């Protein structure tokens, strides 16, 4: 996928912003890369909301391993096109730059696609209320003395 590591995400965001890439004459100092990856970690922590929010394959670094740039991220191939676009949108205020409208639209589309599958999977209907009789057509649950629905419990 060529974007396996977090540093690849940071470099893709920087290239999209135009600040630096592989074909540029001047490059960014490593402390700025550290700041950008810290910002990526903070942004990814804010979307998860601890299991309640957006759910995507992502592993947070441990600190027992020193370099957080090198370790791989469990992002599935579809989420990459959204994550580094959002990262590039967020890094723009760090410099004097402002993200182009195309990047904003791409980030919107990417987040929508990230959350649509979870939204479909979480749209569930609650069980019957406790005081709801089961009609005389079941003929088995009616004969097992279990006339009423159990409840939401």
């Amino acid at each position: 996928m060529q974007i396996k590591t977090k540093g690849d995400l940071v470099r893709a965001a920087l290239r999209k912003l135009g600040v630096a890439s592989d074909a540029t004459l001047t490059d960014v100092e490593p402390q700025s890369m550290q700041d950008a990856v810290d910002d990526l970690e903070a942004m990814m922590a804010e979307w998860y909301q601890d299991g309640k929010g957006i759910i995507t394959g992502y592993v947070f670094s441990d600190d027992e391993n020193p370099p957080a740039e090198g370790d791989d991220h469990g992002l599935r191939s579809s989420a990459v096109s959204a994550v580094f676009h959002n990262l590039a949108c967020r890094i723009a205020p760090d410099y004097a730059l402002e993200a182009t409208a195309k990047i904003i639209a791409t980030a919107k589309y990417g987040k929508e696609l990230l959350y649509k599958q979870t939204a479909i999977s979480r749209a569930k209907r609650a069980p019957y209320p406790s005081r709801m009789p089961t009609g005389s057509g079941n003929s088995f649950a009616n004969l097992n003395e279990w006339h009423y629905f159990p409840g939401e419990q």
Binding site: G7, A20, T26, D27, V28, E29, P30, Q31, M33, Q34, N65, P66, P67, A68, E69, G70, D71
Partner: protein
């Protein structure tokens, strides 16, 4: 046999990696000092030079910065660092721990018999092995021995 061929093609940019895992050290400081001394103390440090294309050697601050690639970097760009041989090396993590400490980098040499052998002999070039006289004369130190060819 075909030629002297004393120069090996190898990696011209050093790579520094972690000790407990396999990843390049990012934003890790490097300290260089005298033999068997702690380079962290600024009193024990030795000058460190960048060699540009022109050959001019420019001194810089002692703590060198590594990038995400594992190579020494100055202001975002890769540089070539040259110092006087015989320097202790201490590589530090970005967090502040210690990755490696080398008392004398000359000890990490595949051939150490050469160091002892060079001291206790005199050098004398023989005209026998060299094809021509000028070649022997150019690489001659402390006298020669005149043989055939």
């Amino acid at each position: 046999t075909d030629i002297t061929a004393n120069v090996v093609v190898s990696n011209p940019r050093p790579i520094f990696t972690e000790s407990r895992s396999f990843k390049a050290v990012a934003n890790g400081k490097i300290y260089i000092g005298q033999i068997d001394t702690d380079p962290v103390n600024p009193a024990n440090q030795i000058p460190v030079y960048i060699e540009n294309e022109d050959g001019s050697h420019v001194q810089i601050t002692q703590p060198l910065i590594i990038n995400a690639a594992g190579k020494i970097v100055y202001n975002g760009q890769l540089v070539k660092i040259v110092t006087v041989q015989g320097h202790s090396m201490a590589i530090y993590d970005a967090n502040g721990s210690q990755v490696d400490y080398i008392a004398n980098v000359l000890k990490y040499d595949p051939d150490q018999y050469s160091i002892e052998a060079d001291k206790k002999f005199k050098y004398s070039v023989k005209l026998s092995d060299y094809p021509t006289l000028q070649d022997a004369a150019s690489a001659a130190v402390d006298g020669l021995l005149i043989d055939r060819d």
